[PDB]
Symmetry: C3
């Protein structure tokens, strides 16, 4: 069996962030966005949403919220590919933000590469 | 005291994943496998396991579970070294899976590199 | 409107680690140290603290605690800059350790780089 076994997507949200969707819906939407790229197998996109309970942004005594994602793909794609993927996620994430804290909400997406030569993967059958 | 201060190993398991071992036992087996490589000081191998409470694999309405590790080592080793480390961990992780969701469980391991020139470390004495 | 949208700082502490102050206060100290570098916008420094409940260090049956941070900045800075940033954080972290386990506490800091060409960012207005 040949399978990509990636991408891995980790979405971190401060506990005070308010979204327009449930976390499940956000994960669904992020995964649909990634699948729509045509670069990934449907069952290979593996995403998680992590609530941050202990966070600080800057030094000011200002209530703030933030939302960050890190998309990890296999090495080898070109710059334009990586940039497009990050932008497609950022659109999904930014669109899901209802609000949080007492000012605007920073949304960021990193796209990073995993060394495919050393990436190990298996499926453990049911 | 000269010490490596690494590697760092992070294991992530979806909340629906059943294992044959406790998380702590799985960490012990992973650390044993890493120490058996002969590449690391005994006290320098630092591992942690996290359960992902909010996750989604793909878009299909199929219950799925997955297990992932990210091993971080200092830069400067060759490709063969990195590949071998990842394979060793992948065998441990795959061995630990009992089952989850309604189909097979994808297991993956990334081996990544940390810039040793900027890596800061200290031992705060007892 | 123009904003850095980073750095991102993740601090991980074993559950048995005793700190001189709370996790919130440690995050404040870390953010203050990063801001004092003169390299970052005040609102762009985004930090979070995780307590690790399932952790193992080495293979020996000895109680041990550890503390690790990963600072992620945009690619492009020189070696001396990355090293200085890591050292500044390492000082803060090391100074926060009261104790933990039955021997010294390993403290470490990785400084890693995100690809700026693919890094996507937005502020969702209030
Ligand atoms: Na991981
Ligand atoms: Na985190």
């Amino acid at each position: 069996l040949y399978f990509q076994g990636m991408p891995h997507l980790v979405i971190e949200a401060t506990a005070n962030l308010r979204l327009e969707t449930s976390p499940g819906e956000l994960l669904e939407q992020a995964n649909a966005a990634l699948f729509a790229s045509g670069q990934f197998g449907e069952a290979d996109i593996k995403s998680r949403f992590v609530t941050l309970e202990a966070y600080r942004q800057g030094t000011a005594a200002v209530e703030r919220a933030y939302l960050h994602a890190c998309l990890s793909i296999l090495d080898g794609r070109d710059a334009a590919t990586r940039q497009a993927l990050g932008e497609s996620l950022c659109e999904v994430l930014a669109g899901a933000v209802a609000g949080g804290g007492e000012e605007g909400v920073q949304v960021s997406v990193e796209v990073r590469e995993m060394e495919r030569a050393s990436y190990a993967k298996r499926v453990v059958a049911r």
